[PDB]
Design a protein around this ligand. Sequence first.
Ligand SMILES: C=CC[C@@H]1/C=C(\C)C[C@H](C)C[C@H](OC)[C@H]2O[C@@](O)(C(=O)C(=O)N3CCCC[C@H]3C(=O)O[C@H](/C(C)=C/[C@@H]3CC[C@@H](O)[C@H](OC)C3)[C@H](C)[C@@H](O)CC1=O)[C@H](C)C[C@@H]2OC
Lengths: 121, 123
Amino acid sequence: LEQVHLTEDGGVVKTILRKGEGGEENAPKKGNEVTVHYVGKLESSGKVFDSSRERNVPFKFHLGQGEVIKGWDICVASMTKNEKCSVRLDSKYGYGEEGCGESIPGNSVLIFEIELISFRE
Amino acid sequence: ETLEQVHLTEDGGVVKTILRKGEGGEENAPKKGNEVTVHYVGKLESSGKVFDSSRERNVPFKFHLGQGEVIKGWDICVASMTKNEKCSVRLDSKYGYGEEGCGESIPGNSVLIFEIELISFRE
Ligand SMILES: C=CC[C@@H]1/C=C(\C)C[C@H](C)C[C@H](OC)[C@H]2O[C@@](O)(C(=O)C(=O)N3CCCC[C@H]3C(=O)O[C@H](/C(C)=C/[C@@H]3CC[C@@H](O)[C@H](OC)C3)[C@H](C)[C@@H](O)CC1=O)[C@H](C)C[C@@H]2OC
């Protein structure tokens, strides 16, 4: 599968697992509410640190607001409805030097499988 | 004048101070597995600085109780609450983010104070 670089520094690289729907009415825009399912794991250990699938409830947020880690705003802006991708985020686009809890160490590369389920204004 | 500081663990690491009593009736207490809806304000005991408020962004927080969907101190605290209860819970770092902390705002080895209000719950 082809790697799609979403920044010039290699820090956000999206692999499309399942292509989403075509057409502009199917790509979300800045400020829209998006609904996704995701599974986040560390690249280095493969261990899952957060999963909406495990909670059995999708996650909603407003796109392009900084409500989520930078790599998520960048990744989801590139997706279309029903797309499922695996995105690799350098720590610069994740939790940085600090990390968050033992399950997200400082300077960790994160891998998220993200499925864009739907969006609305 | 009522101070009620409820020690929810033997190690002193989760102490819930009750600010407003919940509605009476055991029917106003959630069970493990129930989805609960809360508002919260989180701050560091050491500096007193707020690091997050669900109120400020106007987005209530929901999770399924007692399933590890949240830091352990939260599962313990919220299991002890009843509908409309408002508390301030003190969590030692072992019930929060431990030696790692979380992001720029929460250093390693931080005691956390959360004001939590249990708004509603369901099956
Ligand atoms: C794609 C979105 C991510 C997804 C984000 C949301 C659902 C939005 C939700 C309102 C989170 C807040 O978003 C503004 C924000 O809340 C804090 O400010 C906060 O006050 C906090 O302490 N909370 C939130 C309220 C419940 C308790 C606790 C928590 O249990 O949070 C959990 C938490 C961070 C657990 C870590 C996970 C890493 C482990 O290593 C560590 O292990 C110890 C434990 C949260 C709920 C995760 O389950 C889910 C997510 O992270 C964190 C300081 C940072 C966190 O944003 C990251």
